[PDB]
């Protein structure tokens, strides 16, 4: 689960501290390491340690840049990122390996360097209608507005609902603010027995909404 | 004294059946210690193949690597439409540990036309100032398409923008959405909106619009 630490907003010249922990089993078991991913394309190893039997290594760019530590007591990994610029913004993956098995990464850390404050999104209703519905389906959704920074996730029924949902990439505003939207279809039939609701969480801003999307009325 | 991992090509596109071949050349000798990830949109990179032609625990035989020394391939056989996504190949004889630039498989697929469903701002965020009318263009291919807003015929510009999903992991399929945003006051001053859609799939253009109220 190397479960991580959630994603960062730190201003330039702050450092962040990202957490990984094997629920389960204890991570120092085994050798632990860093990757970093820009733009969400080109990966760069940044280094390990292996608690256990050494042969910990760095990458010459990020020497200076990174610290690679390890809590035996409560099976956690972590990197300490200083003096940040925008060019650390990236997803930071932590990964454990063991020889000629398991090579398991983490779900990733989105660290966003910015002297911008949070902003936590608005979060509006796509209301199923005649106009939202092609035969006997239907399509409605929310639309996450003004948000920063990223991520945000969003699921549908807490989780129960996946098959026919599409969550939009984010895109900029001119306000310098992300926005995105989810829809889902849905058998039109189907509008008047079970609710349907959208959960959009926004860690760094620390909110959380649950909008009931139905249909519009008067 | 630094291995570049140099990957090609960059984009590859293949039909659901077909035999697929990523290379990957190394700038030094690095043996057989090299291995191969697969990233899904919005999933972590994950693992193939170690030692070059090593699969690990449940992956799939149609994944295959081979090569020795400088020259290393992928082969993808019987491609299928989960197959979409990021390869990475890897060096780890040496330190640093290098990645290549990566690969992105797109699937071919027939033409399939789009729904179109249009969304009026909601009520909500009409009293908070501004207006969002959204247009939703749901599973077509390809990824090609123009979207037109009307407001009361006149045609629509500066004031949207696009999103575009990544192909669909089971039918390879696009989704878009076409956000209009206006103020509260420019949204009440006009009555007809409408985006009209034109792609591959459609003899002619669909419109979709609604009335203010």
């Known amino acids: 689960l190397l479960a991580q630490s959630g994603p960062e907003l730190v201003k330039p010249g702050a450092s962040v501290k990202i957490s990984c922990a094997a629920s389960?089993?204890?991570?120092?078991?085994?050798?632990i390491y860093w990757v970093k991913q820009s733009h969400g394309d080109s990966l760069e190893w940044i280094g390990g340690?292996?608690?256990?039997?050494?042969?910990?290594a760095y990458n010459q760019k990020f020497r200076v840049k990174a610290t690679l530590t390890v809590d035996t007591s409560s099976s956690t990994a972590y990197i300490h990122l200083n003096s940040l610029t925008s060019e650390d913004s990236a997803v930071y993956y932590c990964?454990?390996?063991?020889?000629?098995?398991?090579?398991?990464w983490g779900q990733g850390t989105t660290v966003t360097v910015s002297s911008a404050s949070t902003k936590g999104p608005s979060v509006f209703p796509l209301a199923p209608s005649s106009k939202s519905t092609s035969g006997g389906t239907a399509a409605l959704g929310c639309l996450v507005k003004d948000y920063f920074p990223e991520p945000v996730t969003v699921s549908w029924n807490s989780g129960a609902l996946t098959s026919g949902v599409h969550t939009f990439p984010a895109v900029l505003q001119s306000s310098g603010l992300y926005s995105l939207s989810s829809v889902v279809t849905v058998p039109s039939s189907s509008l008047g027995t079970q609710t349907y609701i959208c959960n959009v969480n926004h860690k760094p801003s620390n909110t959380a909404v649950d909008k009931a999307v139905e249909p519009k009325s008067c | 004294l630094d291995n570049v991992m140099t990957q090609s090509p960059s984009f590859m596109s293949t039909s659901v059946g077909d035999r697929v071949s990523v290379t990957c050349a190394a700038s030094?000798?690095?043996?057989?210690?090299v291995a191969w990830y697969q990233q899904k949109p919005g999933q972590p990179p994950k693992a193939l193949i170690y030692s070059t032609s090593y699969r690990y625990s449940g992956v799939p035989d149609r994944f295959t690597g081979s090569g020795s020394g400088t020259d290393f391939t992928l082969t993808i056989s019987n491609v299928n439409s989960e197959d979409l996504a990021e390869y990475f190949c890897?060096?780890?004889?040496?330190?640093?540990?290098?990645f290549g630039g990566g690969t992105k498989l797109e699937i071919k697929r027939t033409v399939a036309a789009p729904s179109v469903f249009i969304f009026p701002p909601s009520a909500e965020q009409l009293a908070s100032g501004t207006a969002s009318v959204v247009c939703l263009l749901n599973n077509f291919y390809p990824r090609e398409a123009a979207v037109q807003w009307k407001v009361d015929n006149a045609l629509q510009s500066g004031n949207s923008q696009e999103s575009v999903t990544e192909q669909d992991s089971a039918d390879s399929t696009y989704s878009l959405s076409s956000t209009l945003t206006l103020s509260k006051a420019d949204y009440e001053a006009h009555a007809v909106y409408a985006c009209e859609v034109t792609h591959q799939g459609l003899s002619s253009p669909v419109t979709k619009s609604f009335n203010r109220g």
């Open positions: 990964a454990i390996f063991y020889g000629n098995f398991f090579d398991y």
């Open positions: 890897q060096q780890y004889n040496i330190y640093p540990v290098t």
């Open positions: 030094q000798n690095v043996g057989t210690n």
């Open positions: 340690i292996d608690p256990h039997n050494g042969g910990g």
């Open positions: 389960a089993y204890s991570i120092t078991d085994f050798t």
